[PDB]
Every structure is written in C-alpha cells, then in structure tokens.
Amino acid sequence: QGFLVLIETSGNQHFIFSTNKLRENIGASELTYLATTEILFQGVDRVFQTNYYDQWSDTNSLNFLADSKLNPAIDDPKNNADIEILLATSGKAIALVKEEGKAKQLIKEVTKQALINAPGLEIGGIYVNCNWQDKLGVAKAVKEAHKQFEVNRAKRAGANGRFLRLPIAAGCSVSELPASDFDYNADGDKIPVSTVSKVKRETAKSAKKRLRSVDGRLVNDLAQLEKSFDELDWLAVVHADGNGLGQILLSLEKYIGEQTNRNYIDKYRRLSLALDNCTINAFKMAIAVFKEDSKKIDLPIVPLILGGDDLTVICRGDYALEFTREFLEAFEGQTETHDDIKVIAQKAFGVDRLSACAGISIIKPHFPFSVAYTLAERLIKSAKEVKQKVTVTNSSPITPFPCSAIDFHILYDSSGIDFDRIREKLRPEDNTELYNRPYVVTAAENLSQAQGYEWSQAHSLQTLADRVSYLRSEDGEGKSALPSSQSHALRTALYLEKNEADAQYSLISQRYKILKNFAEDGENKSLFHLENGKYVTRFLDALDAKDFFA
Amino acid sequence: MARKVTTRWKITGTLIAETPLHIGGVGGDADTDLALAVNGAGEYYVPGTSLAGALRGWMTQLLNNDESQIKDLWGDHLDAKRGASFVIVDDAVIHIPNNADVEIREGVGIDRHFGTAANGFKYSRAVIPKGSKFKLPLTFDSQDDGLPNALIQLLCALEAGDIRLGAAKTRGLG
Amino acid sequence: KNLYHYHQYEITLESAVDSCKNHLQAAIGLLYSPQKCELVKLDNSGKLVDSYNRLKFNNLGVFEARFFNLNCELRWVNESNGNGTAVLLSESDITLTGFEKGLQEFITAIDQQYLLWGEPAKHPPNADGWQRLAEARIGKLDIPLDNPLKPKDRVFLTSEEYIAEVDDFGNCAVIDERLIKLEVK
Amino acid sequence: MRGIEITITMQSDWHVGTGMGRGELDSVVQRDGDNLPYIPGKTLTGILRDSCEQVALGLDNGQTRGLWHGWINFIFGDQPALAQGAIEPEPRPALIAIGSAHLDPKLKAAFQGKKQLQEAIAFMKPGVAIDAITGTAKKDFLRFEEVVRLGAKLTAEVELNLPDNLSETNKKVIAGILASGAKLTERLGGKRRRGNGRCELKFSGYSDQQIQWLKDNYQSVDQPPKYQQNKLQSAGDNPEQQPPWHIIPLTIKTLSPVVLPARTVGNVVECLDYIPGRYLLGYIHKTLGEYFDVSQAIAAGDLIITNATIKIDGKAGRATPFCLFGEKLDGGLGKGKGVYNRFQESEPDGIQLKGERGGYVGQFEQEQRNLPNTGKINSELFTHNTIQDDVQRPTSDVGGVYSYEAIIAGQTFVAELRLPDSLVKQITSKNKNWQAQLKATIRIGQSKKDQYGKIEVTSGNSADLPKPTGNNKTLSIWFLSDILLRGDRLNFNATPDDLKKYLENALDIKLKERSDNDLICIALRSQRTESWQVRWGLPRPSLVGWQAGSCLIYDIESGTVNAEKLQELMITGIGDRCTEGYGQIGFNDPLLSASLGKLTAKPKQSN
Lengths: 550, 174, 185, 607
Known about the structure:
This is part of a larger assembly, with chains A, B, C and D.
Chain B: E1 7-11, E2 14-16, E3 45-46, H1 48-62, H2 67-74, E4 87-89, E5 92-93, E6 103-104, E7 107-110, E8 117-123, E9 126-127, E10 133-135, E11 138-142, H3 149-159
Antiparallel strand pairs in B: 1-11, 2-10, 3-5, 4-11, 6-9, 7-8
Chain C: E1 2-8, H1 13-20, E2 28-32, E3 37-41, H2 51-54, E4 64-68, E5 72-80, E6 83-90, E7 100-105, E8 108-115, E9 119-120, E10 131-135, E11 139-143, E12 155-165, E13 172-184
Antiparallel strand pairs in C: 1-6, 1-7, 2-3, 2-4, 4-5, 5-6, 8-12, 9-10, 10-11, 12-13
Chain D: E1 2-10, H1 41-59, H2 67-76, E2 96-98, E3 102-103, H3 105-110, H4 115-120, E4 122-127, E5 143-148, E6 153-160, H5 168-184, E7 199-203, H6 208-217, E8 245-254, E9 261-265, E10 268-271, H7 281-288, H8 294-300, E11 304-305, E12 309-312, E13 315-316, E14 318-319, E15 324-327, E16 339-341, E17 353-355, E18 360-361, E19 374-375, E20 379-385, E21 401-407, E22 412-420, H9 421-430, H10 434-437, E23 440-443, E24 454-459, E25 474-479, E26 483-484, H11 496-507, E27 510-513, E28 522-523, E29 526-529, E30 532-533, E31 538-539, E32 543-546, E33 551-558, H12 563-572, E34 585-587, H13 590-593
Parallel strand pairs in D: 10-21
Antiparallel strand pairs in D: 1-6, 1-7, 2-6, 3-6, 4-5, 8-22, 8-24, 9-10, 11-22, 12-13, 12-22, 14-18, 15-16, 15-17, 18-19, 20-21, 23-24, 25-33, 25-34, 26-32, 27-33, 28-33, 29-32, 30-31
Helix pairs in contact in D: 1-2, 1-5, 5-6
C-alpha cells in the first residue's frame, strides 16, 4: 500500500506571457519545465536519498525512468523502495510513495525550491491514499488526485502576495511589479527590471542549451532574435492540444486490459513518454516549413511548450498556418508508429492515430501576447468542435472520431481583440456568417468511414489553401488573376444583402473566370452556401489570409 | 525640438503642360481602360507623390546616384539620422483651359507581318490637352544657410522643361 | 525558527508609535495621507519632532503608516475615526507592554530588494541627514539617508521574505515580508 | 472654460493610418464608432504642438531650451518620457485638452444605415516604385492606399483649464501662441510631405489680432508661472452618519472611448470592462463639495460609490458567479445551454464541465424558467506612436509604438452613490434640486485630456435599498466586486478562513464549511491591482484580494442570521477600501441557491 503524489503547475498561460519581451517568455517556459523535471528530481533525491537527478542529467531525457531496475517497481516488495515515479512531464508530474510523512516532505521540498529558484511560479501538490491491495487503486488515485486538486488550488492562500509595489518603488520596465535590480534592454541600455524578469532572463540561457537536443537551427543568439521579431510584419502564437487524450487518460483502465496496477502504470507511463517523443519529432519535421529563412543563423520560431499533449510556440506570423498544418499531419502520422499508442488508440477509437486541435493567433509585434494567447485558447476551443461534428460510426457512448482541426484569426486593427466581438463583427446579416470555421486538417482518406465525413470535407482546410493559391496565381504580364480593386468590391459586397453579394460575384466572375472555382452553391452563382440554415462562405478568409501561407 | 528649420523656402509658379499629360488612377472619371487620376472632388490633378518622384528621379541622374546626398534632401526611413523629407510637394489641381476638356487618344498595335491592327492590341488613352496649367507646389526647409546647389539646378531643369512627368513618357506625352 | 507578531487595538497612531519607541529607534517611516505620501525618520530616541501635529488623523491626516529598522517593523492602519490596529514584526521575541503576542514558525527567509525612484540629485536637501533622488517620471524624492550619494549611485530598499507551510499538503508560501533598511548600491 | 472649438478644413485628400493595411489595401484609415473617417485627438494635439514648437524656435532664436520652450511645456505639458537625468520639478500637465475632430453631426447622422455611402467617403490611390536602371515599375513595390476625399470639414471641442490666478497678460500670451500654431499648421496625417492631408486649422475666437498682440508684446513676456496642485480642503462639518441609507443610481454612458488601466505592461495598457468607483470621486468633489466635507465623509466611510457595471435589465449587471460551470463542448452561458450551479448540482454523467469566469449576468429570481441575461462590453485596441521630433519619425530611442485597450462609445453603465440620511438632510436642505445638478459630462480614465474619457453622468430616481433573504440554514456569498482583506498582521493576503472569521464575527454567528463530496464549497481567484496616487504622483500600494464573481457558501453552524445586518453589509460592503467601490457583496442570492442545469437562455432610417 501507499500514497499517490501529484505535482501540477497552474497559471502557465499567465507566467509565460505576462511580459512582452521574448527572452523573458523563454525564461518563463524554462522555469515551468525545470520545476516539474530538473528541480523535481533534486527534491526527490534530498528526501529519499535517491539520485534520479544524476541519472536524468547524464541521460538528458526522461526515458531513464522507463527501466524499473533503475526506477524500482515498488509494488514488488522484493524490488523494495520508498519511491517510484509514475510520470513526469511539462507542468505535471506524478510519483508514488508509501510513507505519508515523507510524502509531505517531498511536496514541501519542491515548492520551497520553486519559491527560491522560480519566483512568480505557482506550483503545488497533493497526496492521496491508495489501497494498493485493490486493483485499479492507481487508476482511482489518479482521478481522485485530479478532482481534489482543482478545489485546493482555489482555497490555497494567495500566491501573488509577495512582489508588492508596497512600499512605493520604481516600476519595472516590462511588468507591473516593482523593479528589484537592473538589467539591459535589447540595445544594451541599463534598465530596471523585477526579480521575476531577471530570474527568467537568467534561466532563459538554459533553453538554448536544452534545445540543442532538438535542433541548432532554433536558438543561438537570443538577443538577435528579439531584435528581429520586432522587425517582422506579423508574429503568430500557435497553441495546440491533443484530441481526446485527456479523456483517454481519464479512462485508461478500460484500455489497459489487464486490471493489475502494474499494467496500468506501465502503459500510462509509456504512453505519455511516447507522446512527448512524437511531439518533439513532429516539431523537427514541421520547422522545415521556415524555408525562406533557412539561409541564416536562426529560424524565426521559439518553442515554449513542447510536450505532454501541448505545443505552444511563437513564430513568424505568415508562416504559422503551413507550419501548424505540417505539425498536425506529422503528429498524426507519428502517433500511428508507436505500440505505446496503437493498442490504446485502436481500442479507444478503432484507428492507429490520435489527433490534435490547434488555435493560431496572428498579431503585430507590439500586440500584447497575453491578449493574443487568450484568443488562441478560444480559437482552439472552437476547433475542438470537430469532436462533436464527427463521431465514430454507431458509437455507444457517442464518441469523437480522431480528426485534427485548425482555427485561426488575423487581428487587424479594427477587427477587435476578443473572439466573440471578432465573430460578431463577421456576422453582418443575422442569417449570414462571413467565416466558415473550423477547418478540418486530417485528409479525407483517414476520415472516409466516419459519420460526418461529408461535413468534414466541406470544412476541409484544403479548400481554403486551394482558394488562397488561386488568388496568388498571376496572368502573363505578372499581375494577379484577380486585381486588388475587384477584391475590395467583393469584401464590400459581403456586408450587403445576400442577393447583392450574389449579384456582385456574378458580375466579376463573368470577367475573371477563375472565380468559377470559388463558388460554393454548386450553381456557380453564389459565393455562399446554405449551412445549418445560415449562409456562410470561406471566400472572405481567402481574401484576409491571402498572404499568410509559407 | 520640432525639426530645427533655419530657413523655410516656398517655391511656386505655373507648371505648363508642354505636351499632353497622363497620370493613371485606378478607375478615374474617364470611361476608358487607361483612366486619369482624379482628386476626391473628381477634378483632374497631379498627385504630389508622382511629381515628387519625378523630381527626385532627375536629381538621381544629376548626383549620379549619390544616395548619401539624395537622402539628406528627400529623406530615408532606414537611416537613424535621416527620416522625413525636407522637400515637400503638395497636390496640384490641373486647370484645363477655357472651353477645353479631356481628350481621348486612340492607340493600336500593328502586326509586323500583315501590317494590320493586331487582334486585341487596341487601347484608348485619355490625356490632358497641351497647355493646361497647375501650381508648382514645393516647400523646402533648410537647416543651414542658403539654398542647396543641387536644388538650384533642379529649378533650372524645370525652367528648361527637361523633366518629364506621368505616363507614356517615351511616346508623346509628359 | 519563528516570526513574531504583536497586536494592539483601538490604539491611536501617535500613541502606538510612542509605545514602540524602544524598538523603532531611528527607524525609517512611511506615512499615507489622502493628499500626501511622506517619508519620516524618527529620532534616535524614536520620538518625532511633530508627533501629534504630524500623526493627527482627522484633517486629511495619516490613515496608514509603516516604520521599520534592523530589528523590527511597525504597521498601523485606521480602523475607525483614527483608532487603529498596530502590528509589529520582529524576528526576535521582544516584550511589548500591553500587546497581544503570538508567533508563526517559518522554514526559511530570503532577501529581496526594491529599487527606489530617482537618481542622485545634483544637490542634497538642505536638511542634513537626508539625500535627494530625482527622476522626471515623479520629480523630486527626498529620502532619510545620511551617507552622501555619489553620481550613478542608486538606493535600494532591502526586505526579508519568510517562507512557511500553509497547506497541510506542505505547499510552501510566503507568509509575510518585512522591510529592513535602505541600502546604497 | 469650455466651448472653444477647433475647425478643420481638408484641402487635399487625406489619410490617417491605422499603422497597417487590410488584405488588398496596404494602408487603411482610422474610423470612429460610426465607421466614418475622423482625425484622432492624439494626432490633432501632436500636430498642433509641433507647430507651436516651431514658433518657440522662432522666439528662442533656435535655442532648443529657453523661456519660450518653457511656455510650450507650460501649455502642452512636459514630456517626462524624453527628458532624462535628475529632473527635480514634477512633470506639469497640459492646460489644453482637445477632442477628436469628427464630421458634422448632421452629415454623420445622414449616413446611418447607408453602408455603401460609408464606403464611398474613401477611395483607393495607387503607388509604385520605379527601378532607376530599367525605368519601369519595380514589381512587388506596387502599393494601394486608402485616402479620404478632400473638402471634409471637421471640428473638435477644446477645453482650457487655465489657472484661476493666471495673469491677464499671460492669457494673451497663451492665446497668442495657440493662435500662431493654428496659423502655421498646414498639414496632418500620412504622406504630408507628398501632399496628402493639406488643411486649414483655426480656433473659434482666435484671429490675427491675437497674433498681433504677441508680435507687439512678446519681448516683454517672462517664463510661465510655476505650477501648483489643486489641494483638498477639509472642514469637519459633517453630521455623524445615521440610517437610512439613501441610494442614488448614476448612469454612465461612454460618449468617447475610455481607457481604464487594468494592468500596465511596458508600452501597452490593458483595460477593465467596468469603471472603478474611484474614478468618480473627483466628480463628487466638483459637484457636492460645496454641500458637505466630502473628504471627511470618505475618511469616516460615510460615503460609498460602487463600481459601474454594464447596464442589464434596466439595472446594474452582476459579475458571473464562478460557481457556474458549462458543458465543455456544447454548453455554458455563451452558448445559452448547459449551465450547472455546482453549489447545488452534481456534474452530469461523464461530461466534463469548465467553470465560468468572464462576463456579467443580469437579474435572476426563485423561478425564472430561464438562464439570466448575459452582458458583454465591446472593446478595441487603439494604437499610437511617438515621433522623434528632429528626425520626424518614430525610433526605438523615442519609444516607437504604444497602444491602449479602450471601452468603445455607446456602452452604458450604472453605479450607485450611497449616502446616509445625515448627509442627504444637509444636501437637500441646502438644495432640493441637487439630484438634477448631478447631470454632467466629465473626463475620466487614462489620457483623459485627449480623445479618451468623455462620459455622460445622469442621476436616476432613488432606488430601493436591497433586501437580502435571510436563511437560518445556510449563508451563501457572492462577491459583486473585488474583495480586499488584511491578513492578521495588516499585510494584504488572501486566505479564505480569514473571510470565514470576518463574516461570522460581523454577522455575530458561527459558520461551518459545506462538507459534501460533490458540491463544491469554495470558488475563488486572487486579484492584484496596479494604481496611482494622482494626488501625489506615486503608485498606490499593490492591493491584493479576491476578484469579483468569486463565490462561496456555508452551512450555518450556530446562531441566527439577522436580515437587517445582511442588508447593512450589502449596502456598506465588507473589508477594506469599501468607499471607493471594493467589498461589494451579495448574500443568499437566488442564483447561487437555484439549480439551473435544466434551463436555457431565452430567445433574443435616416433624414
């Protein structure tokens, strides 16, 4: 018998994006990661006299905990130890301990270091019982720790109450905290910053080391890269989450088959590690999209979260769609290749693959990243609606079919800065929506049996990428196959009555024959088609996304 | 401080079309394909940008592309020391003379084999008639004394009528 | 290892400071008023030259105050019509006459700094025992520092945060923060 | 002094950039809340100041610092961003506040509903670069630009708040400088140097005679008088507070955009979606300080002004309870379905829910048959730049771009001014029409002298005092505004058992937490607030607490809950700093009490 211990990092949104300086964002991501990894193992070692930290840093990867000669399978009392790690990942880790007093010490030890080495980070843990003589005890302990932790976060005492500008002291250059020491701007001018910004900037140098495991194309001169994301015409924030994976974790006792706790642990541990590996690998594949910048020192992308179910990166804005598409395609392919996925995904869904949704916010360099990421969460929440629109044939309970999806927005200065206001502005006629989202990313063949296949094809991302490609085509003297002036008249028409917009299309398509490809009625006389009783079109997106493909 | 002008120069007079002129808009008051630019009141006018770039173009020939001189009159967004242009070129409305209106030129392509109008190669350019007038709309801010010698040369080139403006510069107009 | 806290109630601000003078000796003070936020420094005896005139409540007077030195920090805030709670912090147990006493155990404590506004002004305050920090964002700022500031000095406040258990799960939190002294850097 | 107006006539086609394009257009112009072109006040002041500084050069004989630059700093305020070193004098605010120049109101009204006209006001202008060698259009330098048709006549309010002690001589100086700047100004907006945006700018009531007086006198002037703050003056008159509490509803309509700093972060300011009650206290002074000692009342707590929340159902909207959870896919108040009050309802089988956080809910009652109405605040991110005044473009040294979130025009809000009968007797006996006099237009928020901050204030009739339902089984608490509490060492902290102690002591009862395994007892989030003492030019201490919409519930363990005490706390508010709007709270509200999982929301010319 013993206890499960869970350690979870909250507010990861706020901690990373609360300052608009790239180097500070990178630093924040490292503290989040190193807390539930590097720092964690050092905490475990000081409590239980283990040396997990040595073995990891010598390994430079989590897989050292796979072989239970080195990570004792403590459910065997011959392989006796006080401690096992179930799982570690970005912002979350789970460990198993048989002694309540030492369990409490472990949580305290890590959180003490967090307050010291990672000021401004919120992290906390919980211990819960496990009557391990009963099967599924671990499965129960996982779900029990989750649902009890949500409450304790709220009733925990105030994390923020430490860096008070009380008393009155000079404002930090880049945050609402009081400045605590000097550092330097991107030009090297001495400027005052808060300890949080300072300690982030210190920790940021760990990233360019750790990312050498990924690819040296990424980050080598932090300061030069910062003095270039201000030069770019557009940035983007890309956020992506795995479909159903959370529910998969919240249902794993069905899929492991053999109800013994050892089998639950083995698959749960391996699945998560395999998912991290798939995420990193698919990233290496996707960054190939940054082709035009491939001549020069560093690619214009910064990973900030890159494991668990989650990818979160900043990149050059006009690249983000093609980059994110190739990531999703590569991710789905990669997930099929692992046995640690296959047996669970096949039983959970009937296909070798998992899938992921993504939200992409595209922003000017000075746009506050906090606002942009906030929108990205709403966007991906929209894209996840494919879970509802596409379902397993004769599923019971009705369950989402595996299908990756995208939602995105481009924050032009008059387009507002919140999702509802954005979408509202694109509903000029109450029966009409000028957008048609989310875009389905998975290829038709991989969906071809699903209920809602025909819906998924209407919403296929390919339809938009095709149409933008048409607008980028040219006539022989080198001028685009539709002139800009005509495009402006079309956008104007979309705000008019449907019959007026349908007229305008006819007028212009009679001249510029290419627009025959853009009609959606199937009658070659409307840019609109009827959909859920509303009228919608993808055409507007082809205007606004005209430049935003790599 | 606001740009420390020592001496502002206003430099004005009548520009006269010694040939017909065309400056293309995007749709214009003409019915043609190649239709004149017009101001927001629909009047025929010379866009300040088009005239300014015409002058700056001639200055480039004089200075033999010595950009380090050009950019200290006409400005540059790149150099941290430069920024805004010191020459200023306002818009000028064209006064077409009494009892006169925009002419339409016809244009045609001749098939070099058959000696006849080539299929589709026909066009109908609108033009401002010769002798229309518009105000020279320059202003100049000097941060040092006198008048820049190259700028004196430019005004002589305008009095000589050596600078061409608008479209069709090789082929009759401007 | 303990942080000691002390409470008194209804005490008027001037009477609280007068009670604590044995510990607030030479302390820096910071005073909040609807029209002002003014620094003071107590005499070596811990008295103040204007006490009752300065610490008067009613005529837009001080409604919250802090004083601190190496050994202790006093806090006070108006509870009603100039009656208020006083709380002193000390890292060492010290008797205060008529105060309630208690303590919190804490695991460890660490230094923090806060950069004060202003660069060293081109001339001092005419009052000896003061220096002047000036920065156009706020203008002049007068601080009770005795050492003469060199050009390209900066003044830092220094403070000690105390870390303790809060959750029964052993999650650490910063329970409190005490101001120590001003420091030239 | 109000009702001076700038008039502007555009004499060439003109362009005020958004700093970006859209789609096929590389530049598009800023449009107001009525979608028409307009000139932002921040541009207008910036251009007018620039011409005034040209005059200062001509009078300081080109000295970049001097007596007349003193005057410009006096008139248009100091630029503490760019001055550097040990500058001792406080930065002075401007005397002159200038709105955005809008089109004529009648012309603006005529365009209502006529979308195609609202487009036709602008037109596209081309641009191209020519290769110096081949002498042809340089491809991928072809540029299309929106510009606004010339002949537009625009006007903006100006307000001057000259010091009342200002010499009559100095008034003619200021009129002289300001008149001169209008005369000397010739262009504004984009591509000024290539003939866009040529204009005439005039002040109403200034003419060459004003310049003539300067030309005749200027050698006699001096440096401007030194600046002085407008201090308070307490008096101690206030009769001591006695019930009843009167409650005056104040309606606020955003006539211009308003910027309300939630958290500053470098060169950008995030905005709230309510008006903090603290903003109105200046207005309280400017309209009631003749009738009673406002400052004494605040210090005594004899006054409370609530926050302004968006008006819903004719009344103040209420921040969405964090006890509400929506179906992660299909539900929540945003979707009008699937909303569960987790104080009363189990989670549905299998479906994971997410807690609600944002937005506002209207009225609710013991059986409404419908989810409460949901409010929203429309907001936009405005963008600005600083010109480096010598190279006459933005630079990183001058700080480049900055931007503000703003609440847009036409949003409407409600707040309550709460006064004891003691002060109402004094006010009424001095003036029975005082509630008519509360009708005023004022400037609040960030950047309040420019295009931001114009709000209408308008008294309603007196509301009824709230009447909380007593319930001797359970106490349930809704934070209608942020709650600030001191820790037991007077520090700020957020520990819920402090609030447990606080409420049970204040109500003179004992409370026990709801222990049920599947009904959540507590749902709070922390809150931390940037603020500034404008009275003193320093930040306020960082306030820490629980944010509005946090909710929690208890079983009553012993005692009886007095209905009258509940009413008192709902009127006064709990915790610290209640006077400026914190601490507002609601007990046993039917929304926290009812179960909602079955419900849905309701269905929703020109001259």
